[PDB]
Structures are given as C-alpha cells and as structure tokens.
Amino acid sequence: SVPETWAKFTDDNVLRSQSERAASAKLREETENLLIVTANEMWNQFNKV
Amino acid sequence: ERVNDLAFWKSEITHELDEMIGETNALTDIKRRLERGLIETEGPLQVSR
Amino acid sequence: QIRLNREHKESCEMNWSDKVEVYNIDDTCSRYTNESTQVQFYPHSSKFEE
Amino acid sequence: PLRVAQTRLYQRSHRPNVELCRDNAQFRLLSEVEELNMSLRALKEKLQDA
Amino acid sequence: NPKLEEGYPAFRRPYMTALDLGVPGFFPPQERFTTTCHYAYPASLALYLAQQDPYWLHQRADFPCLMEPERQPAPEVGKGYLLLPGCLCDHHQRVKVPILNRWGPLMPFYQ
Amino acid sequence: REMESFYSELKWQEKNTLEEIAELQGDIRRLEEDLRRKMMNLKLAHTRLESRTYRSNVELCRDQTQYGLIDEVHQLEATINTMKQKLAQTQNALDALFKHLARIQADI
Amino acid sequence: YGLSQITASLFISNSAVANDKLTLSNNHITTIINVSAEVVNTFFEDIQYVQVPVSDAPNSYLYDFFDPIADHIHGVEMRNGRTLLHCAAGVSRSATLCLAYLMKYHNMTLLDAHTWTKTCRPIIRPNNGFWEQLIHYEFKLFSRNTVRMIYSPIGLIPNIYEKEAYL
Amino acid sequence: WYRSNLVSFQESNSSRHNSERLRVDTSRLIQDKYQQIRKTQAHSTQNLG
Amino acid sequence: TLSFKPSERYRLSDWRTNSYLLSTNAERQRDASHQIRQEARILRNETNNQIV
Amino acid sequence: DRFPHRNLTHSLSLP
Amino acid sequence: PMGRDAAGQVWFTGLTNSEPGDAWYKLPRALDTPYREAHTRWHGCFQSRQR
Amino acid sequence: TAQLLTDPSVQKSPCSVLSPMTKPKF
Amino acid sequence: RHAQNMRANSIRLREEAEHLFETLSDQMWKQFTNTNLAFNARISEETDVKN
Amino acid sequence: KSELCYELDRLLTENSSMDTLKRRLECAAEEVNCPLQVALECLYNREKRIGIDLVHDNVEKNLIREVDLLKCCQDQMRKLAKRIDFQIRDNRDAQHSLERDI
Amino acid sequence: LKVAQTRLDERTRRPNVELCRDMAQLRLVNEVYEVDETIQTLQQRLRDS
Known part of the structure; x- marks a missing residue:
C-alpha cells in the first residue's frame, strides 16, 4: 500500500462500524414505538369487550 | 512522524470503539425488554380464550 | 572518555524524566475520588489493556 | 465508582514507554469493574421483582 | 433660524x-447590555435577559x-437559590445555602 | 391538555441538551491533546539548554539565546498551569449536564 | 491613591500597593508590570512579572516599549488575565504606557485618552519629555494632532496644562 | 545601523503576529454567530408551534 | 369509601413551580456550558500561536 | 412526534 | 444484518461526495454535512509534509 | 412538608467550593 | 430537630477536616522542598570551594 | 413513625463516616512522626561539623523551621480528633433518643 | 432579522381577546435584540480588520 491508500482503509473501516450504529439507533427507536403501540392497541380492544 | 500518524489514527479507532460497546449494551437492554414483552402477553391471551 | 560520559548521562536523564511523568499521573490517580467531576465513562478501558 | 475505576484505568494506560506495569493495582482495577458490574445486574433484577 | 431683517451675513x-x-x-x-463591552463567563446577554423575561x-x-429566583416554592420557609456550573471559589466562602433543581419529594420513585 | 403541553417542552429540552453534551465532549478531547502537546515543547527547551551548557570558558559566554530560552521555559510552564485549570472547568460543566440530564429523563 | 482600574483588565497603582498581596488577591491580578528600574518588589507566586527599565528624566526613552507592552496587555486580556501597571509613584511613568494602549486598541485620541485617565486617577502628570513621545505616537495612528506642544513663559508645556500655567 | 535593522525586523514580526491572531479569532467568531442565529430562530419556531 | 394513600399531597401551585424551575434550570446551563466551550477555543488559539 | 397515549401508527418497516 | 432479513446495499465511501472547498465561500458550511473530519485532518497534515 | 430546602444534605455551598487546584510536581 | 442539628453539625466539622487535610499536606511538601533547594545550593558552594 | 425512621437512617450514615474521619486523623499522626524524626537526625549530624564549618546557614535555618511546623501539624490534627470524638458521642445520644421514640 | 420582524408585524394583527403577550412574543422581541447585537459585533470586527 501507499500512505494515501493506507489512511482510507482505516477511515473506511470506522465508517462501516459508524454506519452500523445509526442502523442500530433506528432499531432502538423503532422498537420502543412498537412497545408503546402494542399497549395502546391491546387496551383499545380490551375496552371494546 | 510515521510514529506520529500511527498515534493519531489509533485514538480515532480507540474512540470509535467506545460507542460500539455503548450501543451494544443499549441494544441488549431493549432486547431483554422485548423478550419480556412477549412473556406477559400470554396473560391477556389466556383470559381471552 | 568525555563523549562516553555525556552519552550515558543523557540516557539516564531521559529515564529520570519518564519517572517524573509517571509519578505525576500516579499522584493524580490517587487523588481521584468519587465526588470528583473530572471522572468520566471510558468503556473498553477494562477490555483493552496493554 | 465504576466511573472512578475506568478513569483510573485510562490514566494508567497513558504511562509513556516503560514503567507501565501489570502491577497489583491493575488486576485490582479490572476486578473492581467486573465485580461492580455483577452487583449492578443484581440490583436491576431486584428492582424488577419489586 | 436666520430671518430676513438680520441681513446677508x-x-x-x-x-x-x-x-x-x-x-x-x-x-x-x-x-x-451591549456585546461590545468585554464580558466574562457568567456575564452574557442571556444573563441580562435572565430576569426581565419569564x-x-x-x-x-x-x-x-449564585442566582436567586423571584418565584420561590415556599417564601414562608427560608429562601432557595440556583447554582451556575463551572465557576470558582476563593478562601472557602463558607455559606451552606439551598440549591434546588426541581420541586418534589426528597427520594423520588422516577429518577 | 396541561399534562401534554409540559411533556412536549420536556422532550424539546432533552433533545437540545443531548445535542450539547455530545458536542461538549468534543472540546474535552481537543483540550486534552493540546495539554499533552505543550509538554513536548517543554521537553525541547530543557534539552536545548543543557546541551548549551556543554560550552566552556568563552564558549560558556552568556548571550541573548540563553536568556531567551530562560523566558521560554518559565512561560511555557505557566501556560500549562492556566490550561490545566481550564480543563477542569469544562469537566465540571459536563458533570452538571449529566446530573441534569437524568432529572429531565426522571420525570418524562 | 490606592488602585485605579482603567479598563476591565488594566490597573494603575503605586509600588506599595503592588507589594500588597491583599489587593492582588481580591482583584485576581495575574500580571504585574514594573515601569521603574529603581523600585524592587517581592515576587509573588501565581503572578508573572514584567519589567520595563527606564528613568524619570526629560531624556528618558519610552517609544520603544509603547507598542510591545500594549500588545502584551491585549494578549492577556483575551486569555482572561489582568495586568497591574505600577510606577514608582503612579504619577508619571505607569500611566504613559496606559495612554499609549488606549489610543491603539480603543480608537480614542490622546486628548480623549488623557481625559478618561484623569477622571479615573486624579494625580496623573506625565513629564514633558514623555509628552512629545505620546504626541509623536498619535500622529502615527491617526495622522492628526489633538494635543500639540506650545511654548509658555514658563517653558514648553502641553496645551492641556497651559491655562493653569498662565495663572 | 544594527539597531535600525533590529527595529525594522521587530516591527514586521509584531504586525504579522497581530494580523494572524485577528484572522483566527475572526474565523471562530463567524462560525459561532452562524450556529447561534440558527438555534435562536429554531426556538422561536417551536414556540409558535 | 374514599381512602387515599399516605403519601405527599402537593397542591397545584407546587406542580407549576417544579415544571417551571426544572425547565429554566436547563435553559441556563446550556448557555453556561456554551460559554465555557466558546472561551476554551479562544485560549486554545492563543497558546498554539504564542509557542510557535 | 406522537404523544404516548395516542399511538396507533405502526412503523413503516412492517408494511 | 446477519440473519434472515439480510440484504445488499452499495454505499458511498466519502471521497467523491464531500465539501472539500475550504475557501472563504464554502467555509461556514452546513450543520447537515458530515465531512470526514479525521481524514480531512490527517490529509491536511500529510500534504504539507510531502510538499 | 418541604424537605428540599431544609435538609442538611441539600445545603451545598455555592461556587466551586475550593475546586481542584494543585500544581504539577517536581 | 436535634437529629437535624447533630447531623448538620457533623458536616461542618468534615468541611474543616478536609480543608485541614488539603492545607497541611500542601504546607509540608513546600517546606520539605524548599529545604532541599537550600540543601542543594549549599553542597554546590562547598564543592566549588574544595576544587 | 416513618419520619423518625427516615431521619434515624440518615443519622447513622453520617456517624459512621465521622468514625473513619477520626481514624484518618490518628493515622496521619503516626505518618508525620517519620519525616519529623529524620529532620532530628538531620540536625544531629549538622552538630558534628568541625572547625569554622559550624554555621547557622540557610540549611539549618530551614531545617529547624521544618521541625517546628511538623510538630505544629501533629497538634492540629490531634485537636480535631478530640472535637470529632465529642460529636460522635452526641450523635450517639441523639440516636438513642430517636430509637426510644420510634 | 427580516424574518423576525415580519413575524412580529404579522402577530400584531391578532384580534381583541387574542391580542395576548405570549412567551413566543417575548422570545421574538429578544431575538430581534440579539440579531442587532450580532450585527454590531460583526461591524466592529470589520473596522478592526
């Protein structure tokens, strides 16, 4: 490798791991919105009975 | 200087591996609450049947 | 002989300076206590030790 | 105290060239972190039983 | 204003x-409070506005x-204050004074 | 309606606060490596001086450079003392946010 | 007497106040600059000292230190420090450097700068040899002269002091 | 002659140092003002909402 | 038939101040934290320039 | 976003 | 992610899409733009050393 | 009751209360 | 109230106790240090006399 | 009853820390005795000097002055050990009153 | 500065009972003040430059 290529390998290595966090961050936000909604939908149907 | 660049690029790898550990303990939190989100739902189901 | 004397003096002096640095950081590590606000979360500090 | 132990581990890891050691304080600090994590897990379990 | 009778000069x-x-x-x-004048850390435009506004x-x-709120939770009991972060103390300034971040119980369930 | 209106403000305050916390953590890691940088410049002035004491007799004559390096080491040392006090100030302002981040999340 | 704050970070006193530690501690003074080569003060911890050698005579030269000292006060102002400009007596030498700083960094003429200093401290009377050097420095920055030098029956004194001289 | 040369050299050094300090401060100041006016407008938008 | 729990019983006024004072506590620590950061950049610039 | 007591919109990741 | 739901996606390494202006008309930039700051710093230091 | 103004553990001294100031050693 | 005064009195003593701990250990080091500086310059004076 | 029980809990916690704070002072008393004793042996060797070399120099001037300060510091912490001993005892009598109440 | 002044003008048009001094009104007035201070600081730095 040359110095220009060696830096890119390290820089793109962190960017893959960095993009995994934002992919993981959405899952954490998406999951809690499901946990909120399932309680609301279960409560509404339990009321109709 | 070639010692200097290896020290600079090591810190950014070292820094970015904080949030990778930090996100994983955050994801493991919601998974345990989701694993448990499944367990109590048998309650309302058992009273419905 | 003068050249040799000076050379060994510089090597031993650099050892002395390293010891000064390590003494200072160990002193402040001892000074750290649970009410201090300089304290912060440094994950992987347990996992990555060299 | 977990914060305290981790910051101590960081500063100890910053010892420059030599004089950074697998001394008795290092093993202790690692065990502090591990043991306190165990106590934290126990605390979360009891919180939820409550 | 120059009038007609006074003349040309x-x-x-x-x-x-x-x-x-x-x-x-x-x-x-x-x-x-003008921003042209030099100001230190606790002195700013928002500190000038920190009292007139709500x-x-x-x-x-x-x-x-150490700032004082006008709207205190209990004027019948002794006064309370708020603490600005950072800052610096000289000669130990021994005053033990109330600081309050919120009003409620001493040991809250949701913390 | 009052319950809802206070909650939305609580969330707005939290979001702007965790913006500042993450951003402020940037300036802490920039302060620390400058503080580490200045200790390298102190090592030069000491090494510059003792090598200049190898001079002898009329070589050992004093000059502007010797007095110039004298003023460098004293001033470089005072800068670190100023900066070290400023680093510990920012860490205090970080810790105040964490305590107050918990309390906004405490009531949400 | 005592201590006079000229700007948010600049102070003028005598040598006795400069030796006083209590005044320094209460005002959080970081830098003390001695315009007198005859006055010797005790060197205090936490305070970095500057010395400008000159005498009190019509042949004394201060034009050399007019710019570097003014730059040094501004630099310590950004770093949130404070400077104490003290003479042997606080009457002539210390405030001559104070006048030079105000013209350079505050966009005020010498007449306006002296007016502010006289209101702040009543005992200011720079010697005549220092007055031309300030007049020369004003024609530097602004290319116009508000304070000029005139010959009185007493002698060559500035136009500011001419009325009481005629009396 | 020597002191004249020294005078000129010191003058040039001082002027250039002042200019450099001014440039760096100006860059930082402009960036901060940009950020602050953005945040201040956004807060008023939220209040209107 | 109207039993209440033996806990604290703040009036509507106290709930108002706690909401207000907690909010204004976070509004002043973000300016204070901002000023410390902003000033730290100024000090950092002058020390780097001076030693060069 | 949505207040917790009015949340009937599922995520777009399960269409 | 490694599992049933796993898919393929081609992503942009940031060297073509960037804001490498660094003149006085691109300087204030945007809050949106996450330019690669570590690589910009190392690159900025490397150019002068080679120069 | 209002124990957040009268408790002897809520009364913290203002300012930084002699914040960490120590000079480098040796 | 008596348990309040007893508790509040204990803290005021500890505030002096730590402020005592800081000041003495600050004082003992500077005196130990300054003695060695005076001890150092005395050795140099005597050694230059001997040669 | 709960108000007594809560205040009794916080009272115990402060009392325990004062017991350690008392012990820290007594520990720091035996610490200072070691550097103090060396400065005494320091002065004993300076007496051994012969000829005109017997001098009240800046070394001796600072070395006796060191000795007095270390004795001064020891008396200061033993004194605070005394006044912290009474407070613990008044804390205990305060605790006994609360317990008989609840 | 233009957009803040436009918002203030438009909110002056509210009807009689709705002509209320709200926290958004206070915030807009303060925002106009701050924008003016920022402009003054920038002009000062220009003259110094």
Missing part, C-alpha cells in the same frame, strides 16, 4: 446647494454564580 450658517430647494419651510431640517434569576454579586 446671517445667511451663511445652513449650507445648501440647488438640491435642497423646494422643501416646505425652506431651510435644511436640523439634527441595555425566568426571574437575579445575580448575587458576592458569589457570582
């Missing part, structure tokens, strides 16, 4: 050219990072 004070002619009453018509914090000049 009085008619030298107001300078005009042909541009100014036509105006009624012919004569040329006559004639708080937040009512007032600085205590003895201990600069």
Whole structure:
C-alpha cells in the first residue's frame, strides 16, 4: 500500500462500524414505538369487550 | 512522524470503539425488554380464550 | 572518555524524566475520588489493556 | 465508582514507554469493574421483582 | 433660524446647494447590555435577559454564580437559590445555602 | 391538555441538551491533546539548554539565546498551569449536564 | 491613591500597593508590570512579572516599549488575565504606557485618552519629555494632532496644562 | 545601523503576529454567530408551534 | 369509601413551580456550558500561536 | 412526534 | 444484518461526495454535512509534509 | 412538608467550593 | 430537630477536616522542598570551594 | 413513625463516616512522626561539623523551621480528633433518643 | 432579522381577546435584540480588520 491508500482503509473501516450504529439507533427507536403501540392497541380492544 | 500518524489514527479507532460497546449494551437492554414483552402477553391471551 | 560520559548521562536523564511523568499521573490517580467531576465513562478501558 | 475505576484505568494506560506495569493495582482495577458490574445486574433484577 | 431683517451675513450658517430647494419651510431640517463591552463567563446577554423575561434569576454579586429566583416554592420557609456550573471559589466562602433543581419529594420513585 | 403541553417542552429540552453534551465532549478531547502537546515543547527547551551548557570558558559566554530560552521555559510552564485549570472547568460543566440530564429523563 | 482600574483588565497603582498581596488577591491580578528600574518588589507566586527599565528624566526613552507592552496587555486580556501597571509613584511613568494602549486598541485620541485617565486617577502628570513621545505616537495612528506642544513663559508645556500655567 | 535593522525586523514580526491572531479569532467568531442565529430562530419556531 | 394513600399531597401551585424551575434550570446551563466551550477555543488559539 | 397515549401508527418497516 | 432479513446495499465511501472547498465561500458550511473530519485532518497534515 | 430546602444534605455551598487546584510536581 | 442539628453539625466539622487535610499536606511538601533547594545550593558552594 | 425512621437512617450514615474521619486523623499522626524524626537526625549530624564549618546557614535555618511546623501539624490534627470524638458521642445520644421514640 | 420582524408585524394583527403577550412574543422581541447585537459585533470586527 501507499500512505494515501493506507489512511482510507482505516477511515473506511470506522465508517462501516459508524454506519452500523445509526442502523442500530433506528432499531432502538423503532422498537420502543412498537412497545408503546402494542399497549395502546391491546387496551383499545380490551375496552371494546 | 510515521510514529506520529500511527498515534493519531489509533485514538480515532480507540474512540470509535467506545460507542460500539455503548450501543451494544443499549441494544441488549431493549432486547431483554422485548423478550419480556412477549412473556406477559400470554396473560391477556389466556383470559381471552 | 568525555563523549562516553555525556552519552550515558543523557540516557539516564531521559529515564529520570519518564519517572517524573509517571509519578505525576500516579499522584493524580490517587487523588481521584468519587465526588470528583473530572471522572468520566471510558468503556473498553477494562477490555483493552496493554 | 465504576466511573472512578475506568478513569483510573485510562490514566494508567497513558504511562509513556516503560514503567507501565501489570502491577497489583491493575488486576485490582479490572476486578473492581467486573465485580461492580455483577452487583449492578443484581440490583436491576431486584428492582424488577419489586 | 436666520430671518430676513438680520441681513446677508446671517445667511451663511445652513449650507445648501440647488438640491435642497423646494422643501416646505425652506431651510435644511436640523439634527441595555451591549456585546461590545468585554464580558466574562457568567456575564452574557442571556444573563441580562435572565430576569426581565419569564425566568426571574437575579445575580448575587458576592458569589457570582449564585442566582436567586423571584418565584420561590415556599417564601414562608427560608429562601432557595440556583447554582451556575463551572465557576470558582476563593478562601472557602463558607455559606451552606439551598440549591434546588426541581420541586418534589426528597427520594423520588422516577429518577 | 396541561399534562401534554409540559411533556412536549420536556422532550424539546432533552433533545437540545443531548445535542450539547455530545458536542461538549468534543472540546474535552481537543483540550486534552493540546495539554499533552505543550509538554513536548517543554521537553525541547530543557534539552536545548543543557546541551548549551556543554560550552566552556568563552564558549560558556552568556548571550541573548540563553536568556531567551530562560523566558521560554518559565512561560511555557505557566501556560500549562492556566490550561490545566481550564480543563477542569469544562469537566465540571459536563458533570452538571449529566446530573441534569437524568432529572429531565426522571420525570418524562 | 490606592488602585485605579482603567479598563476591565488594566490597573494603575503605586509600588506599595503592588507589594500588597491583599489587593492582588481580591482583584485576581495575574500580571504585574514594573515601569521603574529603581523600585524592587517581592515576587509573588501565581503572578508573572514584567519589567520595563527606564528613568524619570526629560531624556528618558519610552517609544520603544509603547507598542510591545500594549500588545502584551491585549494578549492577556483575551486569555482572561489582568495586568497591574505600577510606577514608582503612579504619577508619571505607569500611566504613559496606559495612554499609549488606549489610543491603539480603543480608537480614542490622546486628548480623549488623557481625559478618561484623569477622571479615573486624579494625580496623573506625565513629564514633558514623555509628552512629545505620546504626541509623536498619535500622529502615527491617526495622522492628526489633538494635543500639540506650545511654548509658555514658563517653558514648553502641553496645551492641556497651559491655562493653569498662565495663572 | 544594527539597531535600525533590529527595529525594522521587530516591527514586521509584531504586525504579522497581530494580523494572524485577528484572522483566527475572526474565523471562530463567524462560525459561532452562524450556529447561534440558527438555534435562536429554531426556538422561536417551536414556540409558535 | 374514599381512602387515599399516605403519601405527599402537593397542591397545584407546587406542580407549576417544579415544571417551571426544572425547565429554566436547563435553559441556563446550556448557555453556561456554551460559554465555557466558546472561551476554551479562544485560549486554545492563543497558546498554539504564542509557542510557535 | 406522537404523544404516548395516542399511538396507533405502526412503523413503516412492517408494511 | 446477519440473519434472515439480510440484504445488499452499495454505499458511498466519502471521497467523491464531500465539501472539500475550504475557501472563504464554502467555509461556514452546513450543520447537515458530515465531512470526514479525521481524514480531512490527517490529509491536511500529510500534504504539507510531502510538499 | 418541604424537605428540599431544609435538609442538611441539600445545603451545598455555592461556587466551586475550593475546586481542584494543585500544581504539577517536581 | 436535634437529629437535624447533630447531623448538620457533623458536616461542618468534615468541611474543616478536609480543608485541614488539603492545607497541611500542601504546607509540608513546600517546606520539605524548599529545604532541599537550600540543601542543594549549599553542597554546590562547598564543592566549588574544595576544587 | 416513618419520619423518625427516615431521619434515624440518615443519622447513622453520617456517624459512621465521622468514625473513619477520626481514624484518618490518628493515622496521619503516626505518618508525620517519620519525616519529623529524620529532620532530628538531620540536625544531629549538622552538630558534628568541625572547625569554622559550624554555621547557622540557610540549611539549618530551614531545617529547624521544618521541625517546628511538623510538630505544629501533629497538634492540629490531634485537636480535631478530640472535637470529632465529642460529636460522635452526641450523635450517639441523639440516636438513642430517636430509637426510644420510634 | 427580516424574518423576525415580519413575524412580529404579522402577530400584531391578532384580534381583541387574542391580542395576548405570549412567551413566543417575548422570545421574538429578544431575538430581534440579539440579531442587532450580532450585527454590531460583526461591524466592529470589520473596522478592526
């Protein structure tokens, strides 16, 4: 490798791991919105009975 | 200087591996609450049947 | 002989300076206590030790 | 105290060239972190039983 | 204003050219915290606004990072204060004074 | 309606606060490596001086450079003392946010 | 007497106040600059000292230190420090450097700068040899002169002091 | 002659140092003002909402 | 038939101040934290320039 | 976003 | 992610899409733009050393 | 009751209360 | 109230106790240090006399 | 009853820390005795000097002055050990009153 | 500065009972003040430059 290529390998290595966090961050936000909604939908149907 | 660049690029790898550990303990939190989100739902189901 | 004397003096002096640095950081590590606000979360500090 | 132990581990890891050691304080600090994590897990379990 | 009877030499004070002619009453018509001033950390524009606006914090000049709210939770009991972060103390300044981040129980369920 | 209106403000305050916390953690890691940088410049002035004491007799004559390096080491040392006090100030302002981040999340 | 704050970070006193530690501690003074080569003060911890050698005579030269000292006060102002400009007596030498700083960094003429200093401290009387050097420095920055030098029956004194001299 | 040369050299050094300090401060100041006016407008938008 | 729990019983006024004072506490620590950061950049610039 | 007591919109990741 | 739901996606390494202006008309930039700051710093240091 | 103004553990001294100031050693 | 005064009195003593701990250990080091500086310059004076 | 029980809990916690704070002072008393004793042996060797070398120099001037300060510091912490001993005892009598109440 | 002044003008048009001094009104007035201070600081730095 040359110095220009060696830096890119390290820089793109962190960017893959960095993009995994934002992919993981959405899952954490998406999951809690499901946990909120399932309680609301279960409560509404339990009321109709 | 070639010692200097290896020290600079090591810190950014070292820094970015904080949030990778930090996100994983955050994801493991919601998974345990989701694993448990499944367990109590048998309650309302058992009273419905 | 003068050249040799000076050379060994510089090597031993650099050892002395390293010891000064390590003494200072160990002193402040001892000074750290649970009410201090300089304290912060440094994950992987347990996992990555060299 | 977990914060305290981790910051101590960081500063100890910053010892420059030599004089950074697998001394008795290092093993202790690692065990502090591990043991306190165990106590934290126990605390979360009891919180939820409550 | 120079009038007619005084004469020509009085008619030298107001300078005009042909541009100014036509105006009624012919004569040329006559004639708080600032950020320019240096300020330290606890002194800023928001600190100037920190009392008039719907937040009512007032600085205590003895201990600069100790502000007093006008709307205290219990004036019948002794007063309470708020603490600005950072700051610096000299000669130990021994006053044990109330600081309050919120109003409620001493040991809350949701913390 | 009052319950809802206070909650929305609570969330707005939290979001702007965790913006500042993450951003402020940037300036802490920039302060620390400058503080580490200045200790390298102190090592030069000491090494510059003792090598200049190898001079002898008329070589050992004093000059502007010797007095110039004298003023460098004293001034470089005072800069670190100023900066070290400023680093510990920012860490205090970080810790105040964490305590107050918990309390906004405490009531949400 | 005592201590006079000229700007948010600049102070003028005598040598005795400069030796006083209590005044320094209460005002959080970081830098003390001695315009007198005859006055010796005790050197205090936490305070870095500057010394400008000159005498009190019509042949004394201060034009050399007019710019570097003014730059040094501005630099310590950004770093949130404070400077104490003290003479042997606080009457002539210390405030001559104070006048030079105000013209350079505050966009005020010498007449306006002296007016502010006289209101702040009543005992200011720079010697005549220092007055031309300030007049020369004003024609530097602004290319116009508000304070000029005139010959009185007493002698060559500035136009500011001519009325009481005629009396 | 020597002191004249020294005078000129010191003058040039001082002027250039002042200019450099001014440039760096100006860059930082402009960036901060940009950020602050953005945040201040956004807060008023939220209040209107 | 109207039993209440033996806990604290703040009036509507107290709930108002706690909401207000907690909010204004976070509004002043973000300016204070901002000023410390902003000033730290100024000090950092002058020390780097001076030693060069 | 949505207040917790009015949340009937599922996520777009399960269409 | 490694599992049933796993898919393929081609992503942009940031060297073509960037804001490498660094003149006085691109300087204030945007809050949106996450330019690669570590690589910009190392690159900025490397150019002068080679120069 | 209002224990958040009268408790002897809520009364913290203002300012930084002699914040960490220590000079480098040796 | 008596348990309040007893508790509040204990803290005021500890505030002096730590402020005592800081000041003495600050004082003992500077005196130990300054003695060695005076001890150092005395050795140099005597050694230059001997040669 | 709960108000007594809560205040009794916080009272115990402060009392325990004062017991350690008392012990820390007594520990620091035996610490200072070691550097103090060396400065005494320091002065004993300076007496051994012969000829005109017997001098009240800046070394001796600072070395006796060191000795007095270390004795001064020991008396200061033993004194605070005394006044912290009474407070613990008044804390105990305060605790006994609360317990008989609840 | 333009957009803040436009918002203030438009909110002056509210009807009689709705002509209320709200926290958004206070915030807009303060925002106009701050924008003016920022402009003054920038002009000062220009003259110094």
